[PDB]
Symmetry: none
């Protein structure tokens, strides 16, 4: 068995941006309610229960390059 694995990555990921300018995120307030009696969690549970998510994600360049190489035998 002879294997060779020479992936040649080169990829430029360019993004210039001379300006972004003013931004405004001014919503109003809102309510949340959840009601139950009991529960039970098992084996890799993930659960957000009740939230108010206000975000302002502003990268001056936010290029997400991602990769996943993987071999197996």
């Amino acid at each position: 068995v002879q294997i060779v694995y020479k992936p040649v990555d080169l990829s430029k990921v360019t993004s210039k941006c001379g300006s972004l300018g003013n931004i405004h995120h001014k919503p109003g307030g809102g309510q949340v309610e959840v009601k139950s009696e009991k529960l039970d969690f098992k084996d890799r549970v993930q659960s957000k229960i009740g939230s108010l998510d206000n975000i302002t994600h502003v990268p001056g360049g936010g290029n997400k390059k991602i990769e996943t190489h993987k071999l197996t035998f």
Copy 2:
């Protein structure tokens, strides 16, 4: 068995943007309600229950390059 694996990636991912200008995200408030008695989670559960998601995702260049190489035998 003789294998050769020479993927030659080169890809430019360019995105210039001289300006973005003003932006405004000004909604109003809204409510959420959930009601039950009980539950039970098992084996890789994922559950958001009740949320108010306000986002302002503004990359001055947000090019998502992604890849997935994979071999097996």
Copy 3:
């Protein structure tokens, strides 16, 4: 067995944009309601229950290049 795998990627993904200009996302508030008694989750459940999703996704260049190479024997 002799295998050769020389994929030559080159692809430019260009997108210039001299300007975006003003943007406005000003909706009103709305309600959500869910009602039940019980539940039970098993084996890779994914469930959003109740949400108010406000988004402003503004990339000054948001080119999604994606790939998936894959071999097997």
Copy 4:
């Protein structure tokens, strides 16, 4: 057995856009309601139950190139 695999990708994906101009997304509020008693999920369930999806997806260049190479024996 002799195999050769030399795909030569070159594809430009260009999209210039000198300007986008004003945009407005100003709807009103609406309600949602779901009602039941019980449930049960199994084996790769995916279920959004109740939502208010407001989006403003504005790429100054949003070219989605995608690929999928795949071999097998």
Copy 5:
């Protein structure tokens, strides 16, 4: 068995941004409520219960490059 693994990464991830300009994130206050009787957690539980998430994520360059190489026998 002879294996060779010479991945040649080169990828530039550039994002210049001459300016970002003023930004404003001025929402109003909202409430959250959750009500139950009891619970029980087991085997890798993750659960946020009740939150008010205000964020202002502003990188002057926030390019997320990520990778994942992986072999196995």
Copy 6:
């Protein structure tokens, strides 16, 4: 008074040239003579008097782009 001045220039000025090849500029000699008695210069004079101009202007790409923006009140 409200003025807005957003000229969006984009113009490519491309000129490839795979080769120019041999060139020869082999003229002969010539004479020049000027005769007078006196003179007098005033207020932004420009005067070449007597010259032998041999030039070989060979740009491998000599695209003259020029512009002139101008406002006034």
Copy 7:
């Protein structure tokens, strides 16, 4: 009075040239003569009097971009 001045220049000025090749500028000698008695210069005079100009201007890329922005009140 409200003025805005956002000229968005982008212009590529490209000129590839794979080769120029041999060039020859081999003229002969020539004479020049000027004769007078007197003179007098005033107020921004410019005067070349007698010259033998041999030039070989060879840019491997000699693109002259030029601009002139100008305001006034």
Copy 8:
């Protein structure tokens, strides 16, 4: 009075040149003569009198970009 002056320059001025090759500038000798009695210079005089200008201006890339911004009140 409110003024805004946001000129967004971006202009690439590219000029590749894989080769220039041989060049030859081999002219012959020439004479120059000027004759007068007297003179007098005043107020920003510029005067070359008698010259033999041999030049070989060879930039491997001689792109002259130039600009002139200017305001006034």
Copy 9:
């Protein structure tokens, strides 16, 4: 009075040149003569009188970028 002056310069001035090759500047000798009696200079005189200018200006990249910003009140 409110003034804002945010010129965003970005301009690449690129000029690659893989090679220039042989160059030769082999002219012959020439004479110069000037004759007068007297003179007199005043108020910013500039005068070259008699010269033999042999130049070989060879930049491996001689891009002259120049600018001139200027305000006034």
Copy 10:
């Protein structure tokens, strides 16, 4: 009076040059002669009188960037 002056310079001035190669500047000798009786200089005189200028200006990269910012009141 409120003034703001935020010029954002970014300009790359790149010039690669893999090689320049042989150069030769082998002219012959020439004479110069000037003749007069008297003179007199006043108020910022500049005068070269008689010269033999042999130059070999060879920068391996001779990009002249220049600027001139200037305000006044």
